[PDB]
Amino acid sequence: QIMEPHDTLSPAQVDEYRKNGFLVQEHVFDEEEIELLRAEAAQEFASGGERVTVEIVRGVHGCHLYSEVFGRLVRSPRLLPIARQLLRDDVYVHQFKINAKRAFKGEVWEWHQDYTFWHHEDGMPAPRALSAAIFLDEVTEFNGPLTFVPGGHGSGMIDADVKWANTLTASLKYSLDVETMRGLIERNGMVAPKGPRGSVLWFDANIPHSSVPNISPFDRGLVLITYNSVENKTDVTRGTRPEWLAARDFTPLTALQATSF
Numbered sequence: 001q002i003m004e005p006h007d008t009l010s011p012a013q014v015d016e017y018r019k020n021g022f023l024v025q026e027h028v029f030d031e032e033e034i035e036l037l038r039a040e041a042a043q044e045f046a047s048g049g050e051r052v053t054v055e056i057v058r059g060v061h062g063c064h065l066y067s068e069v070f071g072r073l074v075r076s077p078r079l080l081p082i083a084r085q086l087l088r089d090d091v092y093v094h095q096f097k098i099n100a101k102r103a104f105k106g107e108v109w110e111w112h113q114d115y116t117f118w119h120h121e122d123g124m125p126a127p128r129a130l131s132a133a134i135f136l137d138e139v140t141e142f143n144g145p146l147t148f149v150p151g152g153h154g155s156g157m158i159d160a161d162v163k164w165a166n167t168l169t170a171s172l173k174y175s176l177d178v179e180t181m182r183g184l185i186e187r188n189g190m191v192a193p194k195g196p197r198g199s200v201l202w203f204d205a206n207i208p209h210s211s212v213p214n215i216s217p218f219d220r221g222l223v224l225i226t227y228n229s230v231e232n233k234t235d236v237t238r239g240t241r242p243e244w245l246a247a248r249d250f251t252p253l254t255a256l257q258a259t260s261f
């Protein structure tokens with residue numbers, strides 16, 4: 001039994017990722033694969049307990065530690081080789097979350113950089129990390145797409161006002177002020193990457209992003225896997241969050257092979 005040989009990004013794709021801070025690959029996973037992930041996401045929403053965020057289940061953290069399916073997903077030959085390529089290291093999962101934005105539902109998600117949280121909360125020493133967002137549904141203009149400042153990762157951590165942090169909370173602990181964002185957006189603009197179901201959106205730990213409610217009759221499910229460089233492992237002595245928000249096992253991930261079961 002055979003896995004398709006590892007596909008990595010072209011130089012042009014790598015260059016685009018480093019310049020813009022994000023990159024979409026369309027149609028990575030097929031409809032049947034996505035349906036398996038959707039069904040498992042529903043199970044995690046139902047069984048997640050303290051790991052679930054509710055408005056009314058909004059999201060769940062840490063599923064790769066509790067779900068065999070999601071544990072295998074993070075080792076997928078469609079994902080792991082590219083994470084290794086972009087971070088130029090062995091990698092592990094720092095954080096796993098599923099963000100469901102149901103038809104005609106959702107709230108405004110304030111501008112933020114993930115790295116600000118991971119640095120201050122978890123002791124991540126540098127922004128040598130990224131997220132892979134798997135599109136469980138087509139992402140459009142109207143179902144609350146992740147919206148970015150292209151190139152906005154390239155001036156490092158932007159000063160935020162501090163208020164366990166959680167980027168799925170209503171009020172973010174570290175949000176970006178109007179003056180800071182104005183300047184960044186005036187220089188760089190805004191982009192909401194679109195794509196079909198089964199696409200993967202790769203984005204930098206330090207890219208500013210935000211989103212709006214879903215005004216479509218269609219759901220917008222995202223599965224977000226945050227890969228971190230093993231060299232860039234967090235300082236567990238500075239971190240206090242549970243394992244399902246910030247991983248403590250820095251064992252390098254290996255790729256899934258094709259077996260008889």
Ligand SMILES: [Cl-]
Nearest residue numbers: 117165166167
């Ligand atoms: Cl976080």
